[PDB]
Nucleic acid binder design. Structure first.
Lengths: 288, 288
DNA sequence: TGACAGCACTGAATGTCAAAG
DNA sequence: ACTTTGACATTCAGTGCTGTC
């Protein structure tokens, strides 16, 4: 039945990561290696083996754009044999090498295999907006972490800036910005840097940001996803935005910065918070 | 009822040959696949799919030893897709490759799966005998046919010899000999020639004028099976001797020649003939 | 008839020894 | 020496048919 694959998928997704698993290991679901395959193929219309391989290579496309980790660390984490096995496989799915997949100014979901929803999926709310150059003031640091740690690392960088700011400020700014940017390495182009900028509107922060500098929030077209929930749901919010909404919208991310907007001045059970993820986009022209 | 499978087994055994059949074609005897099986199973105590499979490789084995046809033929005639199909399976049941199986000097019923006997199977009469070398004058030729055609081909060979021989003979020989012998090829040892020798022994009637050369009837130990009945049953006889008697007695055939003995001097409804088949054997020594 | 274990043939991927370039 | 290339053994995914309960 579908209630079996329903729970199986919740497991896989959360374990493509560390734990190893092939049709045999996946049998640790209670059934025989074969009945399972036919069952999985009935309920989802997909062959279990080729899906797992595609979810892993999908996480891999995201980890290559969002993190600074070296191509090997990323492949090893997702149970791949070696860089070579990884590469070959990767080329088949995205018709390109991981190195060129990362260096690429633009990004599309051409070969992304989003996770599978077996029934009720509520896609984060989204809207298309145009932003105008917004003068900001902030601190920007290069960071390195796994796809699974992004939310935590960013929360730490934001925490420092914010509490340091409120220590010397008579007024509370309405918004806290978190700008993510990627920079291709000029040596071997398999490497790239990732920076996070915690900033405030120039009007707001005024001369209260210790070690702050001028930052120009770039204007242009963006898609804006909104999130409202426990701060602990933020990690899941970002990955589904990159792992399932961008692809589903068949959109192209332009070179630029990702913009997270927080409204801290609005958050003793875990606190509920709201924030918006803004992705720099290039919409396609529909053909008559 | 046990009578239902009784009739099918007979049909099976006489069609493992050309006609194809599986749990679907086999269900073309009335009941549906699922039910038929449980019947054929709760009775015989064997899976009709595995059975039909085992009977074929069994006949594959016999043909590989008694005929000169190329492996691919044997494999096909018994409804097998390719030679590899046949080969894998053959190894499954016999633990040897067909090629080596044929080449082998000695032979045993290791993997031969004899046809099940529901009703009352009257196994042929046997006796272990020891023969002395004997000179015979005869004729021999390399023949080549299928398992189901042996008795006929041989019969025609004795006929020429016999009637050609009688034309000049003042007295009738009391015994006509038929010696089957195999000879490994020298190129691809997946092939082999088969020779039949029709010959006569010195009797108490002075002379004879026969074409041919001196042939040695090799001495040694043999198992003798005797048959009485229509010359049309001779084919059945040979097969049940090779396909079920050799196996049950768990006997081993030594390199050498098979020996048929006919008493045609005593044979207008289909007349009843009498003959003995002698196979070269080497009995096992038991263990204290 | 149905839920489910296990085998058989195909095929893509990877690994191996080696004549070939 | 050193990577390229093809016959061939081994592996495991994938879809189907056999087979027990």
């Amino acid at each position: 039945q579908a209630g079996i694959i329903r729970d199986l998928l919740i497991w896989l997704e959360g374990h493509l990561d560390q734990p190893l698993s092939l049709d045999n290991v996946a049998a640790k679901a209670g059934y025989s290696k074969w009945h399972l395959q036919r069952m999985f193929k009935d309920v989802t219309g997909h062959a279990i083996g080729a899906y797992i391989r595609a979810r892993r290579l999908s996480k891999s496309a995201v980890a290559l754009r969002l993190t600074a980790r070296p191509i090997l660390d990323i492949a090893l984490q997702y149970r791949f044999d070696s860089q070579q096995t990884f590469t070959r496989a990767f080329k088949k799915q995205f018709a390109q090498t991981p190195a060129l997949y990362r260096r690429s100014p633009e990004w599309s979901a051409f070969g992304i295999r989003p996770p599978l929803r077996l029934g009720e999926f509520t896609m984060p709310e989204h809207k298309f907006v145009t932003l105008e150059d917004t003068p900001l003031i902030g601190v920007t640091q290069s960071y390195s972490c796994s796809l699974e740690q992004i939310s935590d690392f960013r929360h730490e960088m934001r925490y420092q800036f914010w509490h340091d700011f409120l220590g010397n400020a008579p007024t509370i700014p309405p918004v806290l910005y978190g700008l993510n940017e990627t920079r291709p390495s000029q040596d071997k182009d398999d490497e790239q840097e990732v920076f996070y900028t915690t900033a405030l509107a120039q009007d707001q922060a005024d001369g209260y940001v210790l070690t702050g500098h001028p930052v120009m929030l770039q204007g242009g077209e963006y898609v804006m996803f909104t999130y409202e929930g426990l701060g602990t749901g933020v990690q899941e919010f970002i990955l589904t935005v990159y792992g399932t909404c961008m692809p589903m919208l068949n959109l192209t991310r332009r070179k630029g910065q990702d913009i997270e907007r927080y409204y801290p001045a609005e958050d003793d059970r875990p606190i509920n918070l709201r924030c918006e993820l803004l992705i720099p986009i290039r919409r396609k022209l529909a053909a008559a």
